[PDB]
């Protein structure tokens, strides 16, 4: 595992959106409607590498959640691993 | 706010120690033996920027193993005053 902190461009503004669809579709948390993905933003690449995981701090609803999303290397299918919150912000 | 992943070498592991030192004098968890800061540990670098620039002081966050299990430690300094203080200790965490 390395790390490192990845900008919140729209590529990683849509991991969030992603990450509120698949917890829309959970139901946990009701319906959310995604605000923005904020920083930090950390990305782990999983080794040859076989995937990542990015772990998000995203703004749904006026609410703060911690996401991790995974990501296969060779498939490119994605995963929500967890969302939980709200929390505070970082 | 400016974040950044730090590395984990002593300074780090005694923001580790610090972390568990306090969290044992608070006394909810049975006691806790530290054993670990692991990677990845970020560090935020606070700024004043109305007026003269300068830095203020840094938030770590940390994954602290004590016990073999892995905790989240967010912890604050002040430069001035070495002021270092626990704001949060949770746990246990799954690994990241």
Sequence with gaps: ?????????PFTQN???????EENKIGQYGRLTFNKVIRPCMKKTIYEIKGYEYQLYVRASDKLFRADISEDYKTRGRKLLRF??????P
């Design 15 to 21: 991991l969030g959106k992603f990450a509120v669809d």
């Design 84 to 89: 939980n919150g709200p929390v505070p912000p």
């Design 1 to 9: 595992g390395e790390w490192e902190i990845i900008d919140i461009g």
